[PDB]
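Hey all, quick one. A colleague (J.T.) asked me to put the 2-acetamido-2-deoxy-beta-D-glucopyranose job into the tracker so the inputs and the structure tokens live in one place instead of scattered across chat threads. No bug as far as I know, just bookkeeping. Sequence used:
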Amino acid sequence: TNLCPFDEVFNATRFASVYAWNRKRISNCVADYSVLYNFAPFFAFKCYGVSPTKLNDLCFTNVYADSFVIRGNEVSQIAPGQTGNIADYNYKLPDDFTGCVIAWNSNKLDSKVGGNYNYQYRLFRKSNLKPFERDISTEIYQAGNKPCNGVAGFNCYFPLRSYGFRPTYGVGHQPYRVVVLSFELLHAPATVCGP
Amino acid sequence: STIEEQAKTFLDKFNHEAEDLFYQSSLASWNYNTNITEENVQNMNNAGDKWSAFLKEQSTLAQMYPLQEIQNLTVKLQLQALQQNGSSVLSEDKSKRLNTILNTMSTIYSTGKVCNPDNPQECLLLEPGLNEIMANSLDYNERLWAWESWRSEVGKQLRPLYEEYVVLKNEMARANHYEDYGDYWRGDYEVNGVDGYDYSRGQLIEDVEHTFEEIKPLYEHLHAYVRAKLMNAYPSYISPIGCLPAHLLGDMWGRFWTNLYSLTVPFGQKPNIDVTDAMVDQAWDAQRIFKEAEKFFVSVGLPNMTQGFWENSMLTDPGNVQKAVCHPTAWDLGKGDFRILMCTKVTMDDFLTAHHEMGHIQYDMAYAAQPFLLRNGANEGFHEAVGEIMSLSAATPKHLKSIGLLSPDFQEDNETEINFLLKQALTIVGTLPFTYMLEKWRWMVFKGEIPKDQWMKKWWEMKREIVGVVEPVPHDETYCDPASLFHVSNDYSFIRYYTRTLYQFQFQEALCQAAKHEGPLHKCDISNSTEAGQKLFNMLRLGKSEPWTLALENVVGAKNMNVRPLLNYFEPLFTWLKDQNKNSFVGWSTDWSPYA
Ligand SMILES: *[C@@H]1O[C@H](CO[C@@H]2O[C@@H](C)[C@@H](O)[C@@H](O)[C@@H]2O)[C@@H](O[C@@H]2O[C@H](CO)[C@@H](O)[C@H](O)[C@H]2NC(C)=O)[C@H](O)[C@H]1NC(C)=O
Ligand SMILES: *[C@@H]1O[C@H](CO)[C@@H](O[C@@H]2O[C@H](CO)[C@@H](O)[C@H](O)[C@H]2NC(C)=O)[C@H](O)[C@H]1NC(C)=O
Ligand SMILES: *[C@@H]1O[C@H](CO)[C@@H](O)[C@H](O)[C@H]1NC(C)=O
Ligand SMILES: *[C@@H]1O[C@H](CO)[C@@H](O)[C@H](O)[C@H]1NC(C)=O
Ligand SMILES: *[C@@H]1O[C@H](CO)[C@@H](O)[C@H](O)[C@H]1NC(C)=O
Ligand SMILES: *[C@@H]1O[C@H](CO)[C@@H](O)[C@H](O)[C@H]1NC(C)=O
Ligand SMILES: *[C@@H]1O[C@H](CO)[C@@H](O)[C@H](O)[C@H]1NC(C)=O
Ligand SMILES: [Zn+2]
């Protein structure tokens, strides 16, 4: 039997910034969802379109796992039909979403004395973001009428900013790791099935 | 892209760059105030320089979005708070001279030393020393010696500095489209915009005068009582129809009359309520005090304290290992970090100060959601008025019996109530005339009503007319008496104490009405009243986002500063004093002088 690789997704050494979030296509393997119940402190285990109990005996074609690191106050922005800075410029979920959202605290790993400046998030974008879209552009944001011409100054800002994680911040400003599961079923034959 | 959108984007960038820089400055300052090391001071100074540079650079950028173009009443408040120039409007030479003058006044106040006659090997500083002589000594010539010395050496060394300080602080204000430096100070109370809730900078003088015209009877009766009780300690120095000499008020300047309780106690056989020995015999520590305060706050509906509060806060004196600054402070480092620095001791005083500081911290926790530039109190007097009322409810005998620190068979006699009320009045009521006098004098000096050669004359004419205190020896134009006070030599506002005193009793009366308390107002406790906690939280969460006229209405029901609640707090004392002063003279004459 070949178990699905949910181990290397949840328990990775390093994660990715929100604006460039990883995606793994978990396919053609049997998936045991009892492994996910490890890591007992879960700040959120909200599930949409399914129920956690019966998730085993209902099997699909492709499963996508998306991972990134946000702050605590923004965990509520990874529900369908929400509005905010992260949900509009960084990661957007469709209104008809099916799947689960998992978030757990990672203060002891992602916060250092002096600051962890390797996690970044987008602050300025021209228009909103269509569902499941990834933008890694770093062009200068033009907020005025005078062309920027690839520099920064009056009404010409740098789109990406950096978190300042420290081991002394509050619960709302401490790092959190989020993994989002998307279940796709289609007329193409179903492959990923449980026990 | 209109101007408003550009302003919103600029504010969004500023709000992210300011939080980080301010957090690094605040953490450096905390580390300096906990330890003491040459390295920690250097780190503090570097972080402070970085923060000051960031603010200096950003104000120039904000002066490119015209103020009239924006109609949001929230972006305008934040941009206005960035657009102040300060002392940058002046030329470089004048700015350097002003900074030098301020530094010189501070360093001449800080290390002022007076020497007794014909004995150079014995000289005293301000603290300790002269503060102990005028707080515990019953000799007359000993107090007058210190009072004259302090204004002879230190007082006379500041007037030439003070004149140029005034003339230079008027130029900065006039370059900022004000009338004088006095109007600049009155800008903390200005509300422009929202209809009905408007307050002008000139209305504050009228409001203060109207409120002070009502406190005069109670102050007169207190003054007559203290005068009657002071003739028995200095038999042949105080006139029964005159004014109190300025050096017999328990302090160098007469700001507080607390140290007169020994001489003016109504009933000396019955002692006050002290729970210091009860706490020790129950084996209490600092942690117990702070958990009791937290339990008090949760009953009214306010939230708990953060898990970081119990880990990153100092609540005990470290000892000989570390050198710390033992001053009770409440810190809001930003980004969810809340701490308290306090060298807690087992004493009722620390028991009350814990409630006070926790009230500060709760107010800080309330407005964490607002933008950075709107994370302060409604005005300069709301914060510690909110902090103070929590200590009033923690000292009432009803609260102490509930927590068990006081015996359950103790009965409240009506003779200790007068003691408590008089002790409170000697600190709260005896300082309002002094505050009003000093602020009026400073306002008139800046405007130009008092000429340069009639400063001390009008200063001592106002004291014989408002406060009721006369000078012991004559003073002329070579003296600078007001500069002898800390808040005058150092550029500080002073009306905040007056406003706070009037606000706290309004808040207390509103909460006691909401808590369905029947009886005298000074026995009030807002414990176990969830309604009285929602009402306060309806004001604590706003910050500066809304005018202070509206925030007051969310608690008290009125939209202006009022004095009747203060008088309802002192009704029994007022009646007792009216009964006690039936065979004495109430009032004073502005002709008698000790040197006459
Ligand atoms: C605040 O309330 C607590 C809880 O008491 C209960 O709730 C009150 C609203 C009221 O309905 C009480 O009758 C309830 O029992 C009080 O704590 C109790 O105080 C009584 C005093 O008679 C004591 O016998 C109990 O052991 C206490 N229970 C505890 C400590 O868990 C508290 O005294 C109230 N404080 C006030 C009124 O100031
Ligand atoms: C703060 O100072 C700056 C200049 O140091 C002021 O900006 C000037 O305002 C005058 C007023 O008419 C203009 O003529 C100038 O063009 C402005 N710029 C400069 C570089 O001088 C600014 O107004 C001051 N702030 C306030 C609130 O008055
Ligand atoms: C997570 O990875 C670490 C390191 O490989 C391992 O020790 C730990 O057991 C893993 N956790 C789980 C739940 O497998
Ligand atoms: C600050 O105080 C702690 C407590 O003893 C000490 O360990 C530390 O060395 C001090 N800081 C410095 C820079 O010495
Ligand atoms: C002012 O701008 C803020 C933007 O956060 C908006 O929420 C608010 O409604 C605006 N005020 C008015 C009166 O529209
Ligand atoms: C505050 O903390 C105590 C113990 O930590 C807990 O019992 C109580 O429910 C908390 N209050 C709230 C409002 O969560
Ligand atoms: C207190 O109560 C006694 C009891 O009769 C009464 O005589 C007295 O006037 C009251 N007031 C004071 C201040 O003692
Ligand atoms: Zn305080």
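Adding what we noticed when we looked at it: Chain A touches chain B through 17 residues (CB under 8 Å). The radius of gyration of chain A is 19 Å.
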